[PDB]
């Protein structure tokens, strides 16, 4: 659906309202990524940069498939967050409450959304048609299936992927969608695809990798933040070698692995130049990564 200056302004107002709700001192938000208090103003700023780059050619901007999807989603997510406060009431202020957890997941979604927007409009101009996917075999798949498209409906992505990497069941497809659809808008962007295919490389065995590392691995934590990982490993502080892992939110495309050390500290690191399987095997051997989510059985990869 076409976007004009007006729908942007309406989105900006909804964003400001979320920011006012999230400023309540009772929430006590920590200034640490993802931090909704900086994410929303930052998304507004980048939207201003985009608008600026399209002055006198708003017609072009308004018709861009990706931009229309993005704005529709921004409106949906901001309304969702407002509805969340309205329905949760005081429950938003109990850390550990389900509605507060819902807000944290939203905060991560806004983080992924801003990273996506910046990836597709670097410097404020659309460059989705030339987005560079990092793994060569994944870039080939995307080109073969979708040409230079920036975004595709989930149904169309699933069908295309299945032809090269078989999906075994509907519930597997829904778990896959949950993993790759970072912006939670039922479309898959070339940026989301690049993220997933970096995280679950190598391409030759993509869905076997994801099934092993995420679908059935007790250590994988979907839509979890740095602070949540520190809180979750706290219950295992006297159990060195307890560990979990998740997408890094500031270095999208990379894994953050948290673990309990011998001296009872919780560290988090992002492996350098090594796919997850190898990071897990190496850390298993060294005794860092032994008990996924503090459990006694660790998958043998």
């Amino acid at each position: 659906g076409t976007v004009d200056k007006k729908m942007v302004e309406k989105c900006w107002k909804l964003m400001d309202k979320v920011v006012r709700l999230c400023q309540n001192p009772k929430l006590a938000l920590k200034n640490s990524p993802p931090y909704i208090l900086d994410l929303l103003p930052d998304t507004y700023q980048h939207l201003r940069t985009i608008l600026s780059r399209y002055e006198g050619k708003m017609e072009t901007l308004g018709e861009n498939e990706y931009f229309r999807v993005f704005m529709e989603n921004l409106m949906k997510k901001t309304k969702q967050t407002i509805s969340l406060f309205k329905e949760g009431k005081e429950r938003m202020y109990e850390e550990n409450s389900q509605p507060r957890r819902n807000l944290t997941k939203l905060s991560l979604i806004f983080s992924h959304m801003l990273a996506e927007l910046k990836g597709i409009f670097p410097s404020g101009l659309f460059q989705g048609d030339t987005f560079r996917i990092t793994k060569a075999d994944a870039a080939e798949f995307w080109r073969k299936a979708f040409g230079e498209k920036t975004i595709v409906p989930w149904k169309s992505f699933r069908q295309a992927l299945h032809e090269v990497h078989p999906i075994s069941s509907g519930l597997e497809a829904m778990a896959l969608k949950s993993t790759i659809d970072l912006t939670c808008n039922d479309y898959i962007s070339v940026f989301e695809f690049d993220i997933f295919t970096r995280l679950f490389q190598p391409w030759s065995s993509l869905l076997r990798n994801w099934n092993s590392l995420a679908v059935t691995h007790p250590g994988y934590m979907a839509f979890l933040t740095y602070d949540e990982v520190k809180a979750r490993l706290q219950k295992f502080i006297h159990k060195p070698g307890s560990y979990i892992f998740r997408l890094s939110c500031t270095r999208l495309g990379q894994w953050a692995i948290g673990y309990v050390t011998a001296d009872g500290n919780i560290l988090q690191t992002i492996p350098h130049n090594k796919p997850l399987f190898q990071a897990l095997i190496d850390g298993f051997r060294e005794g860092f990564y032994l008990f996924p989510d503090g459990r006694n059985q660790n998958p043998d990869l």
């Binding site: 740095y226 890094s248 953050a256 560290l267 988090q268 690191t269 992002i270």
Partner: peptide, 4 residues
């Protein structure tokens, strides 16, 4: 934040 992230260490080695």
């Amino acid at each position: 934040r992230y260490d080695a």
